[PDB]
């Protein structure tokens, strides 16, 4: 916890930013439920609403996760 938290800061790993992005998703949910009066019906309409606003957020988080795991393993990258 001591040494590697220094590496985060030293290397400018946007670690706190990722965490805060989660918290913003948590917040978006909380604010949305209180405003709506209740949402289970329709759940899919809210799923459509979000994807429309953030069409590639989930996709790109998966992309970067895979790339971070690959980097951490030291895998050799090629283009095409």
């Amino acid at each position, epitope marked *: 916890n001591e040494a590697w938290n220094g590496f985060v800061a030293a290397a400018e790993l946007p670690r706190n930013e990722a965490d805060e992005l989660r918290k913003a998703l948590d917040n978006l949910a909380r604010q949305m439920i209180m405003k709506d009066k209740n949402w289970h019906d329709k759940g899919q309409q809210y799923r459509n609403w979000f994807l429309k606003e953030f069409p590639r957020l989930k996709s790109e988080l*998966e*992309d970067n*996760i*895979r*790339r971070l*795991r*690959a980097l*951490a*393993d*030291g*895998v*050799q*990258k*090629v*283009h*095409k």
Partner: antibody, heavy 121, light 108 residues
Framework: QIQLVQSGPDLKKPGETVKISCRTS????????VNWVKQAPGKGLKWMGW????????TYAEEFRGRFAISLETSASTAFLTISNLKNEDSATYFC??????????????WGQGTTLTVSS | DIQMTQSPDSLSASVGETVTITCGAS??????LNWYQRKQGKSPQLLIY???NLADGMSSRFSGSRSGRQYSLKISSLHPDDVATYYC?????????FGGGTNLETKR
């Protein structure tokens, strides 16, 4: 054409050492990784480990930490699997395969023909 | 380490039928999943990478799909030369663990 050609089948006694060669051709050897896979009798495939053909970093599955060593002869575009202190359960067919990472996905895209090792007295 | 649970252990189908084989990852692997085909006495060959991408040179009859932690390999129209053992593989982080394999046979 891309090719990985492995050394031939071998019979070894328990305790001995074997070196399995994987001679590659048809691509930039130091741009792709090499990993090794153990084929047990039946269906089983066990991923063994990987070597970085540029840096020389290796990574092994837990099961293969002790007696297994992956090495290189870059000038010959060749990778080696050396197994020391051969034990009874080392009898298997071993595969080398190129490891490609295209920036998104990681896979063994080209494979050697395999090397069948028998450990017996 | 990530466990890959493959199902079924074996199955058989008639030429022209569609086949589905599935693979469960012990945790989310975010699409980092390969399928391999291993014909008897032959080296495994890459079939699918990135869960859904057809390896170059392989038949379009093969396709991959994903639902959460569940990955599926589909053959749309079984051919006799599809007889093989099929393996999923965790390709997210090392070790790149293989599933136990699914044997596919043909009925005739």
């Amino acid at each position: 054409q891309i090719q990985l050609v492995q050394s031939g089948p071998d019979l070894k006694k328990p305790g001995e050492t074997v070196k399995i060669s994987c001679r590659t051709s048809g691509y930039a050897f130091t741009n792709y990784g090499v990993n090794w896979v153990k084929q047990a009798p039946g269906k089983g495939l066990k991923w063994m480990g990987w070597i970085n053909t540029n840096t020389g970093q290796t990574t092994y599955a837990e099961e293969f930490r002790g007696r297994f060593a992956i090495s290189l002869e870059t000038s010959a575009s060749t990778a080696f699997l050396t197994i020391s202190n051969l034990k009874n359960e080392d009898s298997a067919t071993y595969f080398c395969a190129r490891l490609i990472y295209d920036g998104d996905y990681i896979s063994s895209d080209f494979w050697g023909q395999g090397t069948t090792l028998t450990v017996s007295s | 380490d990530i466990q890959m649970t493959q199902s079924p252990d074996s199955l058989s189908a008639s030429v022209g039928e569609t086949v589905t084989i599935t693979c469960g990852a012990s945790e989310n692997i975010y699409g980092a999943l390969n399928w391999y085909q291993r014909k008897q006495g032959k080296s495994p060959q890459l079939l699918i990478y990135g869960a859904t991408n057809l390896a170059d040179g392989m038949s379009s009859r093969f396709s991959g799909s994903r639902s959460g932690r569940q990955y599926s390999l589909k053959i749309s129209s079984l051919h006799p030369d599809d007889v093989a053992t099929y393996y999923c593989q965790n390709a997210l982080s090392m070790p790149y663990t293989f599933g136990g394999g699914t044997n596919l046979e043909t009925k005739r």
